Coordinates of C-alpha atoms and ligand atoms in Angstrom, one line a residue:
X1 CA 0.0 0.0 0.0
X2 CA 0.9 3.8 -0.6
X3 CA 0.6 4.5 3.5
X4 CA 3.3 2.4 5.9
X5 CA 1.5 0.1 8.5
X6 CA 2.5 -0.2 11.9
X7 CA 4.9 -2.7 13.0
X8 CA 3.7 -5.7 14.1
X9 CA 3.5 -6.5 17.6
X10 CA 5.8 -5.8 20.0
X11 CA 7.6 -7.3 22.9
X12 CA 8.2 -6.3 26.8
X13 CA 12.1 -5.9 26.9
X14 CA 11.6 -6.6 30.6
X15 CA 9.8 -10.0 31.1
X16 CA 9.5 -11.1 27.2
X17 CA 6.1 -10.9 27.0
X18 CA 4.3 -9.9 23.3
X19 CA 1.8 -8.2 22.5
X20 CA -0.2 -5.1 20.4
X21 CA -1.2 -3.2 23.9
X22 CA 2.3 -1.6 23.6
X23 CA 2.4 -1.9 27.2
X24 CA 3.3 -5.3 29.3
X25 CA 0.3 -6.2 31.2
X26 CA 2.6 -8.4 33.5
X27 CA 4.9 -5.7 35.0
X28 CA 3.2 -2.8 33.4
X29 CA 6.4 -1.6 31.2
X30 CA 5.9 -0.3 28.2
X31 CA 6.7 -3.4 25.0
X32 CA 9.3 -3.0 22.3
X33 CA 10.3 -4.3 18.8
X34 CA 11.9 -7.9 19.7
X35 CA 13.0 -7.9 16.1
X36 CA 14.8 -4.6 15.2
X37 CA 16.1 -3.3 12.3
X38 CA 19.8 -5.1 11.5
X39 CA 20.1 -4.1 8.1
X40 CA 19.9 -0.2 6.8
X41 CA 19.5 1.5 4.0
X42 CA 20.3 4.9 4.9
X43 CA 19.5 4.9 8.7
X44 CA 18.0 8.1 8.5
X45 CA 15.6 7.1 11.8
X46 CA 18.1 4.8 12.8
X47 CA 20.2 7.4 15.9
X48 CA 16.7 8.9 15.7
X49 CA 15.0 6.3 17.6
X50 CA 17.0 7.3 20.9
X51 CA 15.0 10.7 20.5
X52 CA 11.6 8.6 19.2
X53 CA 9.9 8.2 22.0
X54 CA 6.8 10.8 22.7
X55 CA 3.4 10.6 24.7
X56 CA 1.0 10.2 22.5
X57 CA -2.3 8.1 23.0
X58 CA -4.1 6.8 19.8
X59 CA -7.2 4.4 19.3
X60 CA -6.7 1.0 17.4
X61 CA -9.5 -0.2 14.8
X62 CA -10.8 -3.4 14.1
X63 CA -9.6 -5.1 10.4
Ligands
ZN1 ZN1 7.3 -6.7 31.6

């Protein structure tokens, strides 16, 4: 498709726990991409990520 979708689920760096609440309902730490990026293009995001993370609360919708 012309629009990127979102990644697919993530993973709780803390326990190991995955899921697509983006938050680990076990400790209650937020979840992260298990399976980064290992191979880049450019890495134009890639330092970026550090500086990524923002407060930001969004609704999911049903496929
Ligand atoms: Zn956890």
């Amino acid at each position: 498709g012309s629009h990127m979708v979102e990644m697919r689920m993530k993973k709780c760096p803390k326990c190991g726990l995955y899921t697509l609440k983006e938050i680990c309902p076990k400790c209650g730490e937020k979840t992260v991409i298990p399976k980064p990026p290992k191979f880049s293009l450019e890495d134009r995001w890639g330092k970026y990520r550090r500086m990524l993370k923002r407060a930001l609360k969004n609704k999911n919708k049903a496929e």
